[PDB]
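Hi W.,

Here's what went into the run:
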Amino acid sequence: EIKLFGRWSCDDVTVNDISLQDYISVKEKFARYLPHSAGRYAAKRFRKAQCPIVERLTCSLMMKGRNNGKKLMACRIVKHSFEIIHLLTGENPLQILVSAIINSGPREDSTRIGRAGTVRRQAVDVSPLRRVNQAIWLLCTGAREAAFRNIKTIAECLADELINAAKGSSNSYAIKKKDELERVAKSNR
Amino acid sequence: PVVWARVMKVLGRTGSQGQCTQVKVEFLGEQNRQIIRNVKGPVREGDILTLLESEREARRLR
Amino acid sequence: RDKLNNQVLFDKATYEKLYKEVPAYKLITPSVVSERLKIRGSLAKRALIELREKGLIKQVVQHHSQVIYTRATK
Amino acid sequence: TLWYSHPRKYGQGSRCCRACSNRHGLIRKYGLNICRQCFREYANDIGFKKLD
Amino acid sequence: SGGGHVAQIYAIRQAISKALVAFYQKYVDEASKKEIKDILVQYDRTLLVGDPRRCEPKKFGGPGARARYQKSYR
Amino acid sequence: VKDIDQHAVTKAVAVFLKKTGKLKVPDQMDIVKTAKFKELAPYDPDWFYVRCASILRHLYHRSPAGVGSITKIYGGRKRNGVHPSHFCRAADGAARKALQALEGRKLSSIGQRDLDRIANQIVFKQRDAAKQ
Amino acid sequence: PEKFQHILRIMNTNIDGKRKVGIAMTAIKGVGRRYSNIVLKKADVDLTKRAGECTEEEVDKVVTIISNPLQYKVPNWFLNRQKDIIDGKYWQLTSSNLDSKLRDDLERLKKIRSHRGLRHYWGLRVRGQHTKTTGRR
Amino acid sequence: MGRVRTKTVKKAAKVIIEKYYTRLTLDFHTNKRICEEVAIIPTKPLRNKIAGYVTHLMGR
Amino acid sequence: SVHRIRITLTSRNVRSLENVCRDLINGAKNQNLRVKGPVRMPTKTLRITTRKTPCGEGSKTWDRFQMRIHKRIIDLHSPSEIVKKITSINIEPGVEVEVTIA
RNA sequence: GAGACUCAAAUAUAUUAAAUAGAUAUCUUCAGGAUUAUGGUGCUGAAGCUUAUGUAUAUGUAAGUGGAGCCGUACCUGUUGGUUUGUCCCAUUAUAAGGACACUAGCUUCUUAAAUGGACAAAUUGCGUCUAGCAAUAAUGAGAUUGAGCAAUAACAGGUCUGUGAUGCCCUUAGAUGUCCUGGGCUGCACGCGCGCUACAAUGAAAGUAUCAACGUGUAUUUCCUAGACCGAGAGGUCCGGGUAAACCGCUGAACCACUUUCAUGCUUGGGAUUGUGAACUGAAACUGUUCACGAUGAACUUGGAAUUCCCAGUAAGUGUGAGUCAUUAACUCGCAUUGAUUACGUCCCUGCCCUUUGUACACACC
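Here's what came out:
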């Protein structure tokens, strides 16, 4: 009764990141089979760790006005792309997803409003509640412009950076623009 | 740049445009260093957190 | 800006050329054949329907707006 | 008889203003015919308490 | 009836869950009622958390309930 | 009929009366656009009379259903006139004479057990067809 | 299918080798996408054919519908011109005469000098479009 | 904390125990019922007001 | 032979609509008029909105107004010779009785 | 003053409550299957198939014809009609009881409330200046069911005399500004601007297919809502209806999505401005236009300079319907309903704002 998330094995998925353990929970208490929830996943400050990540992996897709609204198409497009994550590197796709957030994680600073005035200095840490959700924010951009005037579709461009976000990534993708962000932040910090 | 820092105590922010939790954290191998760092974003009490800059925290007295 | 103004065609000169290409090319997507030369988009998908000889395919998606194929992995 | 045009049976003109004889400001199409600048003074006694 | 192409399928879940809980209360067995609840309530996927979140009345100056269109030349 | 959803079954029945000679072809069938919203003519005619499967549920559940009550609520996904879209009537016309294609009152008197059970025998045969 | 030419050409318009045969027909001015099934199946042209296909023995009978849409059962409302006005003849004049005829009703009207006449001097939208607002473009 | 006892739920509370501490206990849902006998509330949300606070002080 | 006189009753005030079940229906069920209980109808709500302000210039919102009138139906399986006295007593301000004759 | 009270779906039908809805139960009828058991039957010509003409082409029959099934039941799954004090009684043309039985041979879940109920808070928590220790946690309709409306004090040269037979003063009065007719015009356009919709297409444009709401809505002295057949590329036209309305429209069987396709990214089948043309139709009457049809015509524009709008949940936003002005004219307006996010769960920088000390030449208050 724990098998078959979409079509594949569900368990044996490890968050291989100190200090991301005991905060990113995908399977170990969330054996929820489809990434559509009904009502509401926010009543207080701390709610995103209590949501399944694969639920959060879908809801960021509805943007840009004309695509805002249809979570079922987000349910359509991700379950039609896991086979591309299953055919490339034939191990189970869910272990590839949790490893994808690691290399796409900005585990570093951000730019801070100064302690007497305007914004020049560095915010010396970024919360995992802020970080890995913004790791979802970077990926949902780049495939759309990879499909906007290009006439390849997103289903291959979702699998574009995701096979690179799991391993050590190649040249600049949707995983990038944050690796660029910490170079100017290291000159900041 | 590889050490991880766990939180013990929380204080407020110079928030308005870049709320960043000026917060009391300590390491594990360097757990005697309870340096009061500054994390951007919401943080629950009891969370171990990664870190690369392990030198200072830009102290203003509070 | 790329143009790629290739011919939509039954591709008789290259159907045997892709026939030896798809082993061991398991990445047979309807977009990458349009990313290949002699760009067919619709009948090239139907050319993978012509690749349905119970060989060199494992069809995994039969859907609206996408018919995603993998090869018959040995 | 003479010099009296306008066969009024179409549109607003001239089926107007059973409350003020002011043709421009009517609300009609429920059955009110109250010329709604003559409604706030004339809201009682015709029901119509406000509830939200 | 009601619902839609999404939310009408939702209310099947509350129906199919509580159908066992009342047939086990008054007709079958107490532990049969107990063995169907503890498997559910681990996370329960709001099978019984019937949140009364409903559509809110609209206001003025907006196209929505808690919206307001603006810029009257600030 | 209460078997699997008629995405494929409505494709099936539209050829079966087309097999048995009861096509009863329209006259402007290359001209019609089934409503004053469409910009292209359809590919063929078989998708027109697929609504006998609808009235296997609409005479069943809605009503003995007339032409006007059908086609207005029928076939709406419409992008109307450009500024901006509305909803329309889909402009039936000749399909109100589709009863001749089948040959208080009832619309189809043979689709009670004579005609529809054969189509129910088809999905029962399709149950045997999809059994392997 | 076809390997020889893959570039079609008719009177006043050339056709590429990419557009489908309904919309390659629409690539000629004077006809639109509604005729893509109408005049092609009136010429018995398969819509599933390609631009390299639909050979020259088929395209001439299309011109017989162009040169005479009356004999091919096309109604006047289904014609690009009906009740001309002058000579009254219902027509489709695909890329060859509507380019001339567009001023032909107007070149009367320059001498008629009606409501719609003098407006074509300066540039004005001849239906109820309020021209004060933009005043340009 | 965020909800504050107002004057009506406080200044009227100072006599009702002072008159009738006898035969009154800390049990709220019956002290909820007792407000109808010694007093007359207009509305039961104010009974939901005035009875909870006086039961929030019986140990105090 | 025997008549089934089905009578609608309506009013705006719910208290008078609560008053009529206190006095009318028990003065008839004492002699088996077959009331079949209070048949309450959904109300007829109406909302009218317009500009609240003559020369409405400024923060130009609107005013809402509501109305509620409720119905409760009393049908009876009894002939015409019994039911004339209940039309005489009791009568209330703003209640509407409707009995069909011809 | 704020609170408090007013309204709105969650809340035991636990109590009476149905021309809403019906749950049901079974009567049934609309019956497939062999899911069932088969009785007659099964290679002997069954099923199926044609011709002839009567009857007004179907059917009848034979021949034609063909080689396994036929026909009937019950179980399964389905129309329909009533199951109101059920059945059979009766008065009655037929309801009720009267006569008995199940002694309930359909009851009130549901929609409707008219009500009390309804986080109704000792809610556990190293008690903070004993005083109001966040803690989510206890419930398990319920961790506010929960949003508006109502809003003071002194006021401002805010808004309006064109809402008014509220109205001062001033203007006019057979040669009127008044008033009714004929007209035009407010819509006129090198130009500035704001409010919104149409897109800038691959989360699509197309085709079908699956198959989902709700506030409402609707004709008596004026022609509304419409169904049903009928005609028409359509637009619309004709005929018989219903509905003064939980009753008919209508159970309104809404859009976007969802499902196979067609398109190959090419200002392109994306995007529909422009402009001819007839075809409509409303109104006595249409011409920068009454709107709507058909088949033509395919511009501008591929994300928009400095700028700057709103907003923390069923919300934003997409996507619709109704209502309002109406003879016809919605792209706005008032709510309805569906689909359903990121992120905030703060701060006092910045434009803000609220009264505590505070200097002042501050005054008609830094304009």
